[PDB]
Amino acid sequence: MSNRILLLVGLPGSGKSTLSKELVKCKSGWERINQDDMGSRKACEMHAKRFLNKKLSIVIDRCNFDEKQRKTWIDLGQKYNVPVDCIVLTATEQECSERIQCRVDHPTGVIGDSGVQILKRFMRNYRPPRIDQLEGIQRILYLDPSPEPYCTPERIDTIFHLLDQCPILEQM
Numbered sequence: 001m002s003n004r005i006l007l008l009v010g011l012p013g014s015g016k017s018t019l020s021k022e023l024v025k026c027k028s029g030w031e032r033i034n035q036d037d038m039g040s041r042k043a044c045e046m047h048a049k050r051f052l053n054k055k056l057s058i059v060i061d062r063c064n065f066d067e068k069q070r071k072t073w074i075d076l077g078q079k080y081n082v083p084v085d086c087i088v089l090t091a092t093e094q095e096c097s098e099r100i101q102c103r104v105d106h107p108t109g110v111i112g113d114s115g116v117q118i119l120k121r122f123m124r125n126y127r128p129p130r131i132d133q134l135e136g137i138q139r140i141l142y143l144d145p146s147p148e149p150y151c152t153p154e155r156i157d158t159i160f161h162l163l164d165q166c167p168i169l170e171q172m
């Protein structure tokens, strides 16, 4: 089938919303799941089921910061027999700190010097997926930041091409 669950993993300020907003703009048949606008994680799940029932692809724009957080979405993939691909945004804590410092307001409340302190607290819990330890993810792309702060349609195409060159970890 044409559809997938795309799990974004990355720190606050790493660029998850930038990528996901451009993706749904650029490519037919994609919906963005986001809790800071959606309401609750159950509401995210509810919307995800509705979209998968329509055979849509979904991009999970959440930090997806450890194995237990990712399991929600991997279980959903298994139930629907829909593959789970993952993009890990490889911005460092210092890069994200600098970006957060530049926010004046934000739906997450991770803003400015307050936001920097939040990020520091978060680092205790951030456990991105490893190629070895198998969670049921099909492929993992580790995506370097672009020099530019915006995401183009061309970047979206580059990303999907890079993802296609990633080895299959768990076969459908």
Ligand SMILES: Nc1nc2c(ncn2[C@@H]2O[C@H](COP(=O)(O)OP(=O)(O)O)[C@@H](O)[C@H]2O)c(=O)[nH]1
Binding pocket: 010, 011, 012, 013, 014, 015, 016, 017, 018, 019, 099, 144, 145, 146, 147, 148, 149, 150
């Ligand atoms: N230089 C650079 N900036 C990015 C990139 N991706 C996002 N940004 C910038 O980093 C900031 C945080 O991005 P955001 O999408 O809000 O991060 P999120 O918290 O992970 O949703 C934004 O100002 C973006 O323009 C990237 O690949 N490279």
Ligand SMILES: [Mg+2]
Binding pocket: 016, 017, 018
């Ligand atoms: Mg965001």
